[PDB]
C-alpha cells in the first residue's frame, strides 16, 4: 500500500503544532508620534483582550527588566 516503513525520516509526532492556548491574542498596539508630541493618542484599542494598562504591566514585568 506504499505506507512508509517506520525507518524513514518522516517519523515525528509534533514538529509544528499550535494549541489555542498558544494562539496570539489581539492586544493594544502602541503608536509613535515623532519625538516632541505629548498630546498624541499613542494607543490604538479596537476591542483587544487586555485593552487596558495591564498590557503595560505585562511588558513591565517580563521585558521591562
Amino acid at each position: 500500500s506504499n505506507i512508509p516503513d517506520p525507518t524513514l525520516p518522516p517519523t515525528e509526532m509534533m514538529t509544528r503544532f499550535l494549541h489555542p492556548n498558544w494562539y496570539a491574542l489581539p492586544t493594544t498596539v502602541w503608536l509613535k508620534y515623532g519625538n516632541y508630541n505629548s498630546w498624541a493618542p499613542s494607543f490604538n484599542e479596537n476591542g483587544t483582550v487586555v485593552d487596558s494598562t495591564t498590557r503595560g504591566l505585562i511588558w513591565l514585568e517580563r521585558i521591562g527588566y
Binding site: 509526532m13 492556548n21 502602541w30 503608536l31 516632541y36 499613542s42 504591566l57 511588558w59
Partner: protein
C-alpha cells in the same frame, strides 16, 4: 500613518489614590500638562512659515531674452521664475472663471493656441530654464507603569479591607477557574501523544470527526 512600536509609549497615571494621603500628585499632573504645552509651541515653530525670496553652482539660472519680458530680471533662481510667471498670469486676470493666453505669452511659449492649461505653462517654464528623547520617554513610561502597579496593589488591598468577604470568595473562584485553564494543554506534548496512554473526550471526538 504612525508606525506601531513594540514597547508602551505612555501610561494613564491612575487617579484612584486618596488625594489626602499621597501628596504632590497634582504637582505631577500640573508638570505633565505644562510639558504638554511646552511642545505644542515647538511643533508649531517646526511648521514655521517664512517669506524670504519673493524676488530678492546651480541655484542661479540665466533666463532667455524672451522670458525676460515677463519677469523684469534676466537671472535668478527657478523659484523666482515660476513665482513671477504665476504672478503675471494672475495680475492680468487671465484665468477662465466666467488659462486664456495673452499676446506676449504667445511669444514666450512659442504657441498660437491662445488657450493652455496652467500645468503646461509651468512645464514650458521648466523647458525654458533626536535620540536621547526616546530613552527619556522609555524611562518615564517605565516608571508610570511601576506607579500603575503599586497603585493596583493598593487598590486590591484597600478593596480587601472593605468587603473582605466579597474579595476572598472572588479570589477562591478565580483560583478554582484559572488552575483549570492552565491544565488544559498538558495532554499534547509529543512524548505523551504517541505512547498510547491517552487513547485508551478523545473517543467521542473521533465519532464527530468520522461523521463530519
Amino acid at each position: 500613518n504612525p508606525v506601531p512600536v513594540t514597547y508602551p509609549t505612555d501610561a494613564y497615571i491612575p487617579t484612584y489614590l486618596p488625594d489626602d494621603k499621597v501628596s504632590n500628585l497634582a504637582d505631577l499632573k500640573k508638570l505633565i500638562e505644562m510639558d504638554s504645552r511646552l511642545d505644542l509651541y515647538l511643533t508649531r515653530r517646526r511648521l514655521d512659515t517664512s517669506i524670504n525670496l519673493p524676488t530678492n553652482d546651480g541655484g542661479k539660472v540665466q533666463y532667455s531674452p524672451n522670458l525676460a519680458t515677463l519677469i523684469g530680471m534676466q537671472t535668478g533662481s527657478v523659484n523666482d521664475a515660476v513665482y513671477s510667471i504665476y504672478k503675471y498670469i494672475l495680475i492680468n486676470n487671465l484665468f477662465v472663471t466666467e488659462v486664456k493666453l495673452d499676446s506676449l505669452l504667445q511669444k514666450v511659449l512659442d504657441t498660437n493656441a491662445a488657450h493652455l492649461p496652467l500645468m503646461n505653462v509651468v512645464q514650458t517654464v521648466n523647458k525654458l530654464v533626536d535620540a536621547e528623547d526616546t530613552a527619556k520617554l522609555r524611562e518615564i513610561t517605565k516608571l508610570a507603569l511601576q506607579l500603575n502597579s503599586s497603585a493596583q496593589k493598593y487598590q486590591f488591598f484597600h478593596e480587601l479591607s472593605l468587603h473582605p468577604r466579597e474579595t476572598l470568595t472572588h479570589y477562591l473562584w478565580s483560583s478554582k477557574q484559572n488552575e483549570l485553564v492552565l491544565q488544559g494543554d498538558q495532554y499534547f506534548n509529543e512524548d505523551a501523544a504517541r505512547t498510547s496512554d491517552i487513547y485508551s473526550s478523545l473517543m467521542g471526538n473521533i465519532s464527530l470527526l468520522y461523521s463530519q
